[PDB]
């Protein structure tokens, strides 16, 4: 956390990958399959504003959610249950979140791999997969989200 440069968080991100222990949450049409478009910091990252698409029965819905800082770069937001969202890696070209979602029945551990481009290089994917494993998120459950992101750019 001490090494994170939060100035790299804001910007126009695309989601490339997601991974979760409960795969059903992140498959097409799943509640936590969210097509990022933009993140902005509020009050020097005391809150995050996140704008993304959610598909409902094939139709793209533009949403904006605000997450509030708990501690460090761990944020809380309500969206299909209660979430913590932690920025666990960020660079000029790549951002990785770690999310714990609780829906009243299950806890889902997941990550999202965002890029400034449309893909991760093998080095970037290696980092993403290592971050997943460190947090008990199975790489077997990785979904490539950009390949189904037919929502408006």
Curated annotation (Swiss-Prot):
SUPFAM superfamilies: Lipocalins (SSF50814). Disulfide bonds join 41-45, 60-151. GO terms for molecular function: odorant binding; small molecule binding. GO terms for cellular component: extracellular space. Keywords: Allergen, Disulfide bond, Pyrrolidone carboxylic acid, Secreted, Signal, Transport. Its main location: secreted. Found exclusively in skin. Produced in sweat glands and transported to the skin surface. It is found in: Secreted. CDD domains: lipocalin_OBP-like. Pfam families: Lipocalin (PF00061). Belongs to the calycin superfamily. Lipocalin family. Probable pheromone carrier. This is Allergen Bos d 2. It comes from Bos taurus (Bovine).
